[PDB]
Amino acid sequence: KILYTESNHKRTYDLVSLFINKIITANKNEDEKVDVWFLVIPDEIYQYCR
Amino acid sequence: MKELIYIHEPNILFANGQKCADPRDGLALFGPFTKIYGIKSGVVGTQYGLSIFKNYINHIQKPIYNANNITRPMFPGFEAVFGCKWDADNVVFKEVTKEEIEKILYTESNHKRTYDLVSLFINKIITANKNEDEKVDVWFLVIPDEIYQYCRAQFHDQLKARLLEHTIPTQILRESTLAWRDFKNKFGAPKRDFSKIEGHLAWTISTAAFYKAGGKPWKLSDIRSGVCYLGLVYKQIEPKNACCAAQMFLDNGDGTVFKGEVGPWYNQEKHEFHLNPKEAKALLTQALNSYKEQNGVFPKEIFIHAKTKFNGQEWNAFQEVTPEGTNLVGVTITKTKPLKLFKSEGNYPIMRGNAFIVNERSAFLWTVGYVPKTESTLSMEVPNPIFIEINKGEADIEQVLKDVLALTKLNYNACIYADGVPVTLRFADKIGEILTASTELKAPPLAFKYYI
Amino acid sequence: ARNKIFISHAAPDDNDFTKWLALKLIALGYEVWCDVLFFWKVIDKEIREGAIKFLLATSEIAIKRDGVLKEIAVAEKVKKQLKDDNFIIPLIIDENLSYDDLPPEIIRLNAVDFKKSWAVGLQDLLKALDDQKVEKNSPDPDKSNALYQQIFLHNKGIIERE
Amino acid sequence: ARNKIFISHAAPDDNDFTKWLALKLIALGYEVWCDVLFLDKGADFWKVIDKEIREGAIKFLLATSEIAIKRDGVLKEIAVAEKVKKQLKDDNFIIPLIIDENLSYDDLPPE
Amino acid sequence: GAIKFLLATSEIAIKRDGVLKEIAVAEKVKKQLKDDNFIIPLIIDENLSYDDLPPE
Amino acid sequence: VREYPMSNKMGYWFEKGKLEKDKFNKVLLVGKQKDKHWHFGISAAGKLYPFPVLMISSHIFFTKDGKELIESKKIQHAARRRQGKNWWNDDWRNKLLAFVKYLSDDENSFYLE
Numbered sequence: 009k010i011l012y013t014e015s016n017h018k019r020t021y022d023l024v025s026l027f028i029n030k031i032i033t034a035n036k037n038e039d040e041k042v043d044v045w046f047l048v049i050p051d052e053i054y055q056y057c058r
Numbered sequence: 059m060k061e062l063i064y065i066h067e068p069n070i071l072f073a074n075g076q077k078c079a080d081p082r083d084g085l086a087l088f089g090p091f092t093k094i095y096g097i098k099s100g101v102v103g104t105q106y107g108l109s110i111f112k113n114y115i116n117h118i119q120k121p122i123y124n125a126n127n128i129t130r131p132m133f134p135g136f137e138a139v140f141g142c143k144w145d146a147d148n149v150v151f152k153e154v155t156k157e158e159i160e161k162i163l164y165t166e167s168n169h170k171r172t173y174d175l176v177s178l179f180i181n182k183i184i185t186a187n188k189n190e191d192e193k194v195d196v197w198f199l200v201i202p203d204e205i206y207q208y209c210r211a212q213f214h215d216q217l218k219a220r221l222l223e224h225t226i227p228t229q230i231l232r233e234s235t236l237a238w239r240d241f242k243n244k245f246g247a248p249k250r251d252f253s254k255i256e257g258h259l260a261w262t263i264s265t266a267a268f269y270k271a272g273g274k275p276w277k278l279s280d281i282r283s284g285v286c287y288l289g290l291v292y293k294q295i296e297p298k299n300a301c302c303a304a305q306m307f308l309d310n311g312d313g314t315v316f317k318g319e320v321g322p323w324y325n326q327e328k329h330e331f332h333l334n335p336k337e338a339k340a341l342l343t344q345a346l347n348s349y350k351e352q353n354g355v356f357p358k359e360i361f362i363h364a365k366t367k368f369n370g371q372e373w374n375a376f377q378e379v380t381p382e383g384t385n386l387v388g389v390t391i392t393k394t395k396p397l398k399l400f401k402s403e404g405n406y407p408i409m410r411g412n413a414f415i416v417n418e419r420s421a422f423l424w425t426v427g428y429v430p431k432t433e434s435t436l437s438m439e440v441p442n443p444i445f446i447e448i449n450k451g452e453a454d455i456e457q458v459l460k461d462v463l464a465l466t467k468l469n470y471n472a473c474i475y476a477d478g479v480p481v482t483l484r485f486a487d488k489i490g491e492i493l494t495a496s497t498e499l500k501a502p503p504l505a506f507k508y509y510i
Numbered sequence: 511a512r513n514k515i516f517i518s519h520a521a522p523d524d525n526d527f528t529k530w531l532a533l534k535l536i537a538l539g540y541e542v543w544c545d546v547l548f549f550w551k552v553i554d555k556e557i558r559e560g561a562i563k564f565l566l567a568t569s570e571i572a573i574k575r576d577g578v579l580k581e582i583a584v585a586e587k588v589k590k591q592l593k594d595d596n597f598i599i600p601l602i603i604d605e606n607l608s609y610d611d612l613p614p615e616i617i618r619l620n621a622v623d624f625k626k627s628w629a630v631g632l633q634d635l636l637k638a639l640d641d642q643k644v645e646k647n648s649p650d651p652d653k654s655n656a657l658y659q660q661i662f663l664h665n666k667g668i669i670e671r672e
Numbered sequence: 673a674r675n676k677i678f679i680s681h682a683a684p685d686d687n688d689f690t691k692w693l694a695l696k697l698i699a700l701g702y703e704v705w706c707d708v709l710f711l712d713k714g715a716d717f718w719k720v721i722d723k724e725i726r727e728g729a730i731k732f733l734l735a736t737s738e739i740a741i742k743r744d745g746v747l748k749e750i751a752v753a754e755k756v757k758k759q760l761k762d763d764n765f766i767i768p769l770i771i772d773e774n775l776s777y778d779d780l781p782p783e
Numbered sequence: 784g785a786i787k788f789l790l791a792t793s794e795i796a797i798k799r800d801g802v803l804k805e806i807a808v809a810e811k812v813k814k815q816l817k818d819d820n821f822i823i824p825l826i827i828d829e830n831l832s833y834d835d836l837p838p839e
Numbered sequence: 840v841r842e843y844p845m846s847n848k849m850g851y852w853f854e855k856g857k858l859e860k861d862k863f864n865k866v867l868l869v870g871k872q873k874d875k876h877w878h879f880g881i882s883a884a885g886k887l888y889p890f891p892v893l894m895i896s897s898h899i900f901f902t903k904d905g906k907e908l909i910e911s912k913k914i915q916h917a918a919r920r921r922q923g924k925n926w927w928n929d930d931w932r933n934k935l936l937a938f939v940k941y942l943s944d945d946e947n948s949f950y951l952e
């Protein structure tokens with residue numbers, strides 16, 4: 009659904025907001041002391057978002 | 059002749075799912091439910107404070123023996139209980155000079171004095187977090203006595219509040235606590251004597267540090283699944299009130315999840331300690347959505363409890379935003395009517411867990427009593443029981459008693475046998491004391507680690 | 511067969527250490543025999559036939575206790591018949607016990623250090639046990655649970671009088 | 673047969689160096705006996721330290737340091753090391769590995 | 784009570800663990816006394832090579 | 840009974856000398872603490888829920904020479920917090936029951952006009 013947005017600015021910003029929001033929330037709600045957040049990004053993210 | 063039903067002690071899960079009734083025994087025997095690799099300390103104090111902190115950490119490395127070992131369990135040592143390492147040599151120390159504290163204290167404005175005292179420590183903490191690559195799990199603030207007594211718009215509340223946007227677990231330790239031997243009230247004896255309770259002090263401090271560093275010392279399992287035990291606390295701002303919510307529930311893996319559920323809900327009203335329909339609907343939608351995202355399906359019961367009674371309008375709003383198939387139970391827990399039970403022949407108070415059922419819609423519960431497990435009663439004097447009233451909805455008055463007693467056993471800020479009031483209410487109270495100590499946050503963190 | 515680890519110590523004082531260690535060893539699948547966990551004839555019996563290791567909770571009072579040295583004396587005797595040099599393992603716990611007041615039947619031996627932290631000592635003890643191939647059952651929390659309650663989680667019992 | 677490389681060192685600080693030294697030699701396949709890494713708990717350590725120096729050791733490595741030469745318990749391993757060296761007619765037996773910066777071949781024991 | 788610890792050393796007195804226990808305590812006591820001239824061995828066995836004794 | 844006003848309730852205690860040897864039912868209800876005199880006191884609030892009862896609450900009041908009340912609330916609270924350590928479960932029960940039994944008019948009750 010984020011992939012199909014027309015504007016490239018909206019495409020890259022929403023994908024960034026997708027990953028960081030989950031990380032940010034999981035760094036405020038989860039009681040787990042995560043050390044490094046590893047973002048295993050799918051390959052569609054790399055080249056479709058370009 | 060009045061009959062008192064008895065509610066049995068619930069069991070709290072420990073390492074490998076093993077059950078016990080005392081955290082001070084369950085941890086020392088079994089170990090925490092989840093183990094962390096270790097705890098990187100972080101200290102913001104003087105050279106005196108850093109020396110005290112290192113001395114205390116190395117002291118709790120060794121076993122701690124308190125005078126009455128039989129009644130209060132001894133402390134094996136930090137690594138012996140929790141299984142992780144907590145060394146005093148891994149300190150990312152950020153020095154605070156007594157002189158800058160002195161120039162802060164000399165300012166005429168008391169509000170500016172406390173703001174600057176908070177700002178010193180928090181800005182040093184922020185600087186280290188963003189500059190020092192050394193990972194710090196918990197920041198331990200060894201404050202001197204001058205801060206505690208001169209500064210009295212609270213130091214602790216603002217300090218915990220102004221760090222919320224950065225999500226930094228912190229632990230304030232007044233140097234009077236860590237160096238109690240060398241803090242005497244000019245008589246030649248300590249101002250407060252920890253000698254007979256040194257082991258319990260080690261228990262409390264170590265448990266607080268372990269929790270704030272990503273470890274779960276123990277979890278609960280003796281609660282009904284599918285129910286979202288939800289607690290509200292109202293705090294005064296002077297003519298506004300501030301509602302704060304804390305929620306506890308069992309997940310798909312049958313693991314209790316205890317987390318705050320706080321959103322800003324400010325009401326300015328003549329009739330105080332009540333919510334407008336919009337605030338209540340928001341409240342309940344937030345909690346239900348949190349349960350939905352944690353478990354997928356909606357709760358089978360929303361066990362709303364509070365220290366106050368709900369009016370009609372907010373309950374109608376609650377029902378309106380509630381989906382179908384979910385029941386709402388509103389319970390008021392009050393601790394004001396003195397019902398002091400004296401045992402006929404003897405010298406030790408009524409056992410904890412006794413319950414007096416008034417009727418189908420009320421009960422008395424002795425969440426504080428005399429616990430044989432430690433042989434030490436939780437109350438010096440006669441313990442006042444909590445009045446549990448099923449204000450709204452349908453419920454079993456004994457089931458509510460056992461549920462409240464279970465909720466009284468999750469205080470991570472202290473490793474006592476059990477809490478006098480249910481933990482959700484006390485932690486929501488702490489949140490309200492902190493979340494109302496600074497500017498409104500767009501999204502406060504929902505982990506107690508940052509508050510307690 | 512001998513598949514039990516005798517734990518000797520001072521009766522009124524060393525209870526705390528032995529209780530933790532015995533429960534710790536039981537939780538790991540071992541078979542532990544402690545007087546606090548569980549008469550002189552009986553004590554000797556285990557050391558003479560049932561015991562496979564003799565762990566000495568050594569402290570400034572456990573070496574001045576007449577009844578403990580007798581358990582050491584029989585332990586020295588049993589150690590010889592078994593042709594096992596590694597029979598008596600001196601768990602040193604007291605802070606002020608420093609390798610100069612040790613009784614002569616234990617001085618020749620190397621202790622397991624518990625003076626600085628119990629956790630590393632238990633880590634040391636387990637290492638010695640596996641190095642010496644002491645057999646141990648599965649740490650099932652069932653029969654072990656029984657001992658745990660018999661020790662503390664049965665004490666939780668609530669007298670049911672009116 | 674004597675196919676083990678004994679290591680002597682000061683008890684408290686030399687551990688770090690010896691631990692790295694012991695593991696590397698083991699990783700290379702050299703059999704190694706360290707007084708803290710291969711000593712069983714509860715044994716009569718001199719009984720087994722002396723015995724293996726006489727019987728188990730084919731090389732003797734001394735982690736030489738400013739305190740490893742002033743340590744009473746190490747020189748005893750040296751003193752027996754010289755004796756077993758004599759019977760073994762192997763002059764290349766004791767190898768005093770010098771690690772300390774401040775120790776420079778002018779406060780070393782005559783042995 | 785002891786001020787000196789004379790060890791009647793022979794090819795069997797050094798294989799007697801009971802005896803080795805008595806040295807083990809002596810040595811420590813020697814450290815308590817800092818008396819390096821405490822254990823003063825007595826070798827009567829010409830069979831003993833004089834150079835086959837415990838490190839202590 | 841001599842009255843001492845609370846914040847939101849009414850306390851009642853015995854002036855020293857009103858009781859025989861300042862004690863009743865072999866239970867001391869007025870005593871001495873250092874330079875001050877402690878006076879066991881009660882406050883009554885009658886409730887109809889669950890069932891009609893008279894909820895009584897225990898208190899400790901302090902006087903200088905057993906005559907007039909110390910006019911410092913902080914001093915009174917501090918004196919009580921220290922005096923509370925001594926008394927136990929049985930000590931509070933005996934004092935409360937003995938103080939109530941003084942109210943008795945007939946053998947097994949007492950009437951309110």
Ligand SMILES: [Mg+2]
Nearest residue numbers: 266471509510
């Ligand atoms: Mg706290």
